[PDB]
Structures are given as structure tokens and as C-alpha cells.
Amino acid sequence: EFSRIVRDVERLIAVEKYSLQGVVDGDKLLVVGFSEGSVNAYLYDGGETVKLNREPINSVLDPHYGVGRVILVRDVSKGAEQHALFKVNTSRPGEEQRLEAVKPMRILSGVDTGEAVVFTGATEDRVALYALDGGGLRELARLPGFGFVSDIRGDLIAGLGFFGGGRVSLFTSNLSSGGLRVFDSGEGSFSSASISPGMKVTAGLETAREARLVTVDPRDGSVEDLELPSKDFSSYRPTAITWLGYLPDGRLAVVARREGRSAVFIDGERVEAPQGNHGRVVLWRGKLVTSHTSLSTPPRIVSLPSGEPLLEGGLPEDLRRSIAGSRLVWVESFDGSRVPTYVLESGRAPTPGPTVVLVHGGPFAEDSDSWDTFAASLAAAGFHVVMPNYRGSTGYGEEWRLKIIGDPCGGELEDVSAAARWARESGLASELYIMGYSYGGYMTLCALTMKPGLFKAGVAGASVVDWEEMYELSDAAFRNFIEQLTGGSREIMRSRSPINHVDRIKEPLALIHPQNDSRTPLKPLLRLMGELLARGKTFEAHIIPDAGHAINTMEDAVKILLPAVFFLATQRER
Amino acid sequence: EFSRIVRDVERLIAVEKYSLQGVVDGDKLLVVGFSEGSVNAYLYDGGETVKLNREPINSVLDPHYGVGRVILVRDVSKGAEQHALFKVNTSRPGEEQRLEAVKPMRILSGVDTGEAVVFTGATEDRVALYALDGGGLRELARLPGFGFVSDIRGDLIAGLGFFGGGRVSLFTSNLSSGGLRVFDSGEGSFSSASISPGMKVTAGLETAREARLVTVDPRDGSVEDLELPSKDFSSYRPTAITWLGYLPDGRLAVVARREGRSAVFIDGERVEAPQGNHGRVVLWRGKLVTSHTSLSTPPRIVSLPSGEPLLEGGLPEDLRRSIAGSRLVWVESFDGSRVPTYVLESGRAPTPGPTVVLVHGGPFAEDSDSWDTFAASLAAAGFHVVMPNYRGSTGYGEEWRLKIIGDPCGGELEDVSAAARWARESGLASELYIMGYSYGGYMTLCALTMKPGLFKAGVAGASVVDWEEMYELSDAAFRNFIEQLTGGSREIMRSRSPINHVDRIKEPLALIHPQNDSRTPLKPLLRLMGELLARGKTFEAHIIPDAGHAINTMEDAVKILLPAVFFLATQRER
Numbered sequence A, B: 001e002f003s004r005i006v007r008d009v010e011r012l013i014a015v016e017k018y019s020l021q022g023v024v025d026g027d028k029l030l031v032v033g034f035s036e037g038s039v040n041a042y043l044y045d046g047g048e049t050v051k052l053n054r055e056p057i058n059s060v061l062d063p064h065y066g067v068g069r070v071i072l073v074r075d076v077s078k079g080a081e082q083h084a085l086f087k088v089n090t091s092r093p094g095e096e097q098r099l100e101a102v103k104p105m106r107i108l109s110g111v112d113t114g115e116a117v118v119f120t121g122a123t124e125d126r127v128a129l130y131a132l133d134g135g136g137l138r139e140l141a142r143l144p145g146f147g148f149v150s151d152i153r154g155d156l157i158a159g160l161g162f163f164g165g166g167r168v169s170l171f172t173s174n175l176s177s178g179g180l181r182v183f184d185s186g187e188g189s190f191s192s193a194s195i196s197p198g199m200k201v202t203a204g205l206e207t208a209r210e211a212r213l214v215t216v217d218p219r220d221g222s223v224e225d226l227e228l229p230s231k232d233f234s235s236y237r238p239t240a241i242t243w244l245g246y247l248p249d250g251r252l253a254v255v256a257r258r259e260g261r262s263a264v265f266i267d268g269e270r271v272e273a274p275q276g277n278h279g280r281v282v283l284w285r286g287k288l289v290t291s292h293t294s295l296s297t298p299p300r301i302v303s304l305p306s307g308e309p310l311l312e313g314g315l316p317e318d319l320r321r322s323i324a325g326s327r328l329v330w331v332e333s334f335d336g337s338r339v340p341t342y343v344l345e346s347g348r349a350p351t352p353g354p355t356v357v358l359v360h361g362g363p364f365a366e367d368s369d370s371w372d373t374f375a376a377s378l379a380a381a382g383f384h385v386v387m388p389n390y391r392g393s394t395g396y397g398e399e400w401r402l403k404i405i406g407d408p409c410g411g412e413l414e415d416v417s418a419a420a421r422w423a424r425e426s427g428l429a430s431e432l433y434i435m436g437y438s439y440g441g442y443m444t445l446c447a448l449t450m451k452p453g454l455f456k457a458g459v460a461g462a463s464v465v466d467w468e469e470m471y472e473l474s475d476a477a478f479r480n481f482i483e484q485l486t487g488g489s490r491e492i493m494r495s496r497s498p499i500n501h502v503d504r505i506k507e508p509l510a511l512i513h514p515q516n517d518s519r520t521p522l523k524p525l526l527r528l529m530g531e532l533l534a535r536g537k538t539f540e541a542h543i544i545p546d547a548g549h550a551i552n553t554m555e556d557a558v559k560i561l562l563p564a565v566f567f568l569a570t571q572r573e574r
């Protein structure tokens, strides 16, 4: 029945998905949309979307309210994520002017004030904060690691820095003269940031098991808790902060979350919103607008508190019926920790039935009540889906997130393995598979090498294979992240690399990998194939042309997803 | 959509295909069939088939008329073609007894007398003629290269030997006492052989541009032309001899061919047969039976002279209509030689239209008026198909066949390239692709490296990549074949290896390869991928698990064929 599968996977990939970016030109929404087979940028106003870009893009920079242009970010390296920036004047959609003062680099983030384009980027030798204005390009600061611009008000630039130990610092700079100041909390990590009318930095602070709001004065580094007019926020007791931002009327919008579902607050007061997860919030036409998604709702743009959709891709009825349910469960792991695990029940599988432990990437990411095309495709193909938030995940507090540091292929793998055991013991699973992309594919390899026999077969997509060789091929941002994750230990880099444990593998493995991935490079995957072959192991492989880690077309998504589904479907017929 | 493609490809692979092997037990036909998703062995006696084997096989040994058992040949190495032999008593189908005296080896051929099993096999160090009887296993003779047992009558064993220069010798042995006698012709190559009631060896002799029948007296090596009672055979002036064999009533059956179509003769008299190609001929309940195939007929078993089908997988009408036409054309090549080229016009493509030069394997093989699943799948996918009998091909005389010796990636490539020129100049092709498996995949790599720009893109399946490295990884039979092809020259082995010319590649390439292929091993392909990556070339790859050069399940066929069709369909949308 592999042709009905191809049709489903294609349709699931093809459904339109929207992301809210801001408000530009004359009170028009700026949205990034996956539509017509690729990622594009649109203006929305009444009913007509207007396409701003020509060729597919990856993202746009964050515009200040009402600015008359959009800065596209586009990979100009066939997936290697050397990106260039292209200005589109909102009054002349489809006319792109490349910003040639900026040589290609990995663009990490940025904001457009209308007078300066401020962005962070990584090259081979550094990560930096840059400003481009009418006078040309300037390097404001070199950063100690991944950094992201959060907000600019006047000359004050605020951002978030991964500058050591897995922890997130706040940073500020000056638009006119550059420099850098770093603010490190001893309680936890800063999570989102926005500059108040008073020129203090409002930030989410994620502590051991909770999250709150703080005010940082960039002049003296003083921090204090921020109390809001309404106490709905406090009383919600979020674990994590998704996003926050000052609206143009001075009110503070915050999206915060717990147990994989978020809520929206304006000056601390709850605003009704559809169940699942939300993104940015903007004031448009004097009304509140956000993005929304859930496990059964592809990302869409909705009005609050109505919940009425402004932009939404429809899911076909027959596909909707493929997802028979979802649940959040707490799996007990090796040390007694409770692993929050999202479960998707297939309507096309019995119970007990074939079940895939689909391991998330990052590692600093989470499985949540948010749309997941891979999880949906598995349900449509007749597999239940188990999605464990292993230690290292976001969404459950700083202490759980930091447990991974210095211990890749250790406790987090136990968490994945405990989720696998739960799926069988709880009676959901008749047979067990493992699948993941990126850090998830790492986990597949680690499970098959370190836990032979636990799974029937594994799918490893865009995998980490060898920390040591990857390190040598990585840009400045990735080198630093590798050092942080591995705790700067060569012994960890080696012992936790599954290329060094190939002899232990006993289960069928499918490798899937984009040839131009600059994060998880193909080179070590070739050596892994060589090891599998020399040792007589069973394996299959699919390498995808002219694509990298970030997939921005339906054609590339099909090529990275379909083989995995075919492979698992074929395994299930054994 | 790709899902309608998956469906047609699957259906084209799934249609049942039959090969006639002999007559066993109580006048029952023995057939090998691709059916129920794999290659199996069957008895047929007027009604439903009876399955002899359990797990899929590769082939059966050639039984003497009426023997009460069948010897299955099965790969027990997950595609690496280390096979074992399994006896099935024809009265107890489905019960297999492994012949343990015979360790796994590449079984090349063999005959079962009912009292002795005589076969040729290759190990790392030898190719040998073996006999297994009540007394155990005995090595009758070591052979100078690939050899195939053709017939046994009494104590006399006759076979065909590739014992130098691409030329085929006859050999004989004695079942009781072993040994080896080799008979060479200065005029050409022996093609098929059967022992007359007079204990002479009747053989087809293929000469420079023609074929005939000869009588070899194994006692003195004397040769003379064989005159048959009816002159239809000699007046047909075949170019090649497909098969010959004495029927149990003493009559000589011959199948011979010219221009990619065969004819069947019985004591020299033509018997009417369906247009296309025929396999072995047997007498069954006193009536003649053979296999038949054509470009629009999957291999089936028919009665002669009527042509009524005994066993036939019916080609669905809608798939039949996907081939709008076929032609045999004579492409003019670089040196004036005329390359007989078979052409399928797709009913789902305009003219001019996307066209694939689909290069056959071997190299000692031909494109003929014979079913080809790959070619049918390309027509169904909306490509015209061009299949050139490049120099080295069978069917057109000894001289054309031996031109390739000492010159791989030379003249034959010119023939393939002339075919591509013809497709464009004749007005068939709007755009050109190259696709092939095995020696065909070699040709793809050779075209992309030596003729950059001629093709839009290529599919290389189970390719020859590096003659030097493959030589070092080959068994005794393959090493010898490699020396024969390359003319024993280390310079040819290197300069005609496309891994040495990777920098020249400019077109998109899709590699497809079974992991356990022992003929065209995966190992050099991994190095090729390393080279393509290091040099920044666009490529995709699909490596198939637990399979080798000889595909014997529908699931493995889908895995080797579908990626090629997807890739070309995608290329066509550029």
C-alpha cells in the first residue's frame, strides 16, 4: 500500500503552514508561509496575501512595527546555510535587492529598525553581532557563542547568548558604537527579551523548575522581578517562557507555557486562545493576533480572543481521522526522574500496535502540543508515536534542560529507553522502532549501539555520528556548542560517538542525510557506512541532493521523510 | 503525481514472470516463477501450480527428464551470492533438504541426473566442476575461468568456458573419473551445447557475423558442420544461438536468433512461435512447450505451434497502452558501425520528449524484443526509452561482441553517446538522461565523467566504479572476467575507472546500490561518494539493505527501481 502512503506523506507535507513575524507597511501582517511547495514571505491585509519574495527563502528578519521593507534570509549555498539578505520594499513586492555589503554567512537572527539591519551571524572564525545602515556594515561585537538579537529600541540592542555551560545570558550592545555587555543569572537562563519604554530589558527567566519575568537595567546590571497589573500570569506558574514583546501601545505581551501547552497574557492578564501553542503576538487593526498550532493543527494565524483564523491551511478529513488521539504521560527513568512524553495514537493501528519512539532534535527543543509533520505521517502510516522529552529538553525547567551537559549518550538515552519500555509495558506497543532527525538521529545511532535488542529497527536522519570529526568541520557557532554539550571533554567526544561502537549493532538501520548539511555533516556518515559494510551489518541509506539541515521545499521534505516511512512500513511486514 | 508512479512501477514489478526449466516427476513442468512477491520454483501439470520451495530462491539446477526431485539454488548470504543447494522431492513439495557436503560458494550452473548433481562453482581461489552423488562430493576439474555445465549424457559432461579473451570454449569431463578437455574454435565462440545419442557434442558456433551448428567429437576434438534433416534452420541464417537441446525422442531442438528476435527449430524445421524471444524447449505429454517474452509480454510459458499460454502474468491493458510504439533502429557510431538500438515510445510523453538512454548490463547481454521492467517503468513514467546494443553486446556476432575486450569506457561508450545523438537528431528527444544497472551503471558514470554536458542527469545502479579495487575484492571467477575485459592491463584498469575522473562531473547523479553486491561491490562506491562530496558535486544515493546483484523479491526490485524513476521525474520538472 506504499502508493497511498506517498499520497499521504505528500499531502501532509503540502498543507500550508504559517508563521507570524510582525506588522509592516500600512498595518499589514508579515507572515512566513510554507505554501505552493516552499517557504515564502507574504503580506496579509484582508483576504489577499501578497508574495514578497521570488525564489524560496528560509526566514525574514524581525521588522519594527510599520517599517516599509522586509529583509529576506535565503540560503545561497544549496543547503549549507551560507545565507544572504535581500531587501524587498513592501510597495514593490517581488523585487529583491541583495545586500551585497554582507558576505554569505550563517545568519542566526536579526531585526530591521527601518534605518539599520542588525543581525548575528557565524563564520568560520567567529560569531558576531553586525549592523548595516546607510554608512555600510559594521561589526558591533564578537560573541562568545551562538547569540540572537531579540530587540532594539533607540541605540540599545538586546539579545540572548549561549555563552557557556548550556546557560542563556542576556546581552546588550549599542547600535552606534558597538561593544558588548553580558548579564548572567545565577538562578537560571534568560529566555526572551524586549526593551521597555523605560529602556530597561524585560526578560523571561527560566529557573530550576519555574519561570518568571525580570527587569534588567543594562546600565548597572541590576535585576529585579517584574510585577504586572494583573496576576493571571503569576498564578499560571509557567515553567518556560516562549516569547515576550512590548506592543506599540506600551502593553507587555507574553506567551508562556507548561507541560507542552502555552497561554497568552497582556500586562499579566490571560487572553483566551485556542488550545496548543502560540508564537508572537501583535496588535493589528487594533486587535490581537498570534500564531497557533497543536498536534492536530498545522501552524495558522488567528485573532484573539476569538480564535477566528486569518490564515490557515486546511487538513483533509481522511488525514485528520488518522490521528486518533494524543496524551501527555510521565515515564520513570533510570534515576527516578519523570520524563514528560507526548503520545500520538494512530487511528490506523491496533492497540497494542507498531509504535515509533520519535526522538526530537536540538537537544534544546521539546515535543509539545504542536504540529509535527513527521509524527503525523507516522500516524497516517499506521504507527503510534511516542515522543519523550529526554533530559536536555526545553519546557520543563533549567535543571532538566542542563542535565544533558557533559553527558550526551548517557542519561538522555536512558530517558528514551525508559519511554520505549513504557510503550511496551503500558500496552500501547506491539513492537518498537526508533526514529529521529538531527540530535534525534544521534539518539537512534546511540540506541542501536548501546541498547541493542531494545528496538526492532531504527531510522537515523541528519545524524550526529562523531563528535570529534564533526567538530573539525564545524563553524564557530557549532564548535562552541559542541564544546558546551560535550563539557569540553575529548573522552566524551569519543566514547559518546556511535561510530566507535558499530560492532554492537544488531538491528536494521536506515540512514537518511542531506548532502550539504553544515550542522551534521555528511562526511562522518560516509565513514559510518564504511564501518557498517566492513562489519557485515545490515543497513540502508538515502542521501539527498543539494539540501542541508533546514528543509524549505516540499520536494526536499519528501526526500527526507518518505524513505523513513517506507523503511518502517517494510519492517512492520516482517 | 509520484503516487501514481509508485503504483505503476509496483504493478510492473508485481506481474508474474516465468522461466521454463524442464520436465520432472510424472511429466510435470518445472518452472521458476516470480510470483507472490518473490522468485520461487513450481510444478505445473494443467491446472494450478504447486510451490516446491519455502523461502525465496534464485534458481534451480537443470533436471534430466522425469527426475523425482529438484535442486534449488538459494543465496544464504543476504545477497552476496554465496549459495547453497537444497533438494526437494517432487512428491513432497515444500520439504527441503540442504546438501551439506557443498559449502556455500557462487554456484554458476548445474545439472541433476537424478543420481548425481554436477555443477560449477566459484570460490576465492578456484572455479571448479564438481559432482555430488552417493559417494560424496568430488572435484572433477578446476576450470580456467567462468564455466557452465550444459549437459550430461551417460558419463560425458559437456559445458561452456570463458577461458580467455572473451571467447567461449567447449569443455568436456567424465562423471566417473573427472578431468578436463577444452575445445577452442579459431572461428568464434561456442554458444550452447548438448550431447547427441551418438555421444558427440552438438554446439552452436557464433562466428564473426553469423552462427551455425557443429558436431564436436570429444574423443579427438574433430569438428564438422551438422546437417539437419530440414533446412529451415540453415536458411534462417541466425546471428546467434540461444539454446539447444536433445528431446527425449531424439530430436534436436534449437532456438536461434537475429536482430533481437528468435525462432524455434526441431530437427531443422521451423515451428511457429509467438513473435519475440524464446527460451528452452521441452516435450511435455508429447507436445512442445517453451518460454516466450517480448517488449510487451512478460516472460510466460506457451504451447507450440499454437502459442496458447500455460502460465502467464497478464500485463494490464492500461500499462500496455503506456508503450505507444517500438522500433529497432540502427544508430551510426563514431567509426561507421551500426549499433542496433531498440526504442520505446511512451504514450505519456510528447514527441519530442524526455528520453532515457537505458544502458544494458553484462556487458555480454543485449537489448532485444524481450520484456524489460525498467524500460516499461520509464515509459509508464512518461519517458521515451533508447536501448543501444553497444559493442560488447551479444546477438550481433562474435566480432561486435569482442570489440569491447581491452577497451572498456572506449568504443562502447561512443556507441551509447551516438545513440543519445540519434535520439536528439531524429527528433525523438527534447531532453536526454542516461540510466543503467551494473555495466549499465558503469556506462552512466563513464558518460558523466567523459561526456559532461551530453546528458541532463544520470542514474547509476550497481555500478562498476574502480576496476582495480573491485578486482581485489572479487572471487576467482570475477577476477578472471575482469582480466579478460580489461585485457589484463593495469593501465586500462585505472584509466577506465570513473572514480579517477570525478572532477569532470557536472551533471546531477543518482547512485543506487545493493549493500551486499559481490560482483559490483559497494565499497568503491562509498569512496566515489567521498570524492563527490569532497569536490562539491551534486549527488544522491540509495543503498538497499540485505540485497546483492541478483534481485529476487518485489520489495528489493521496488527499492532499486523506484528511486531512479523519482529522480528522473524530478529532473524533468526543472
Ligand SMILES: [Cl-]
Pocket (backbone or CB within 6 Å): B017, B018, B019, B032, B033, B034, B039
Ligand atoms: Cl524469473
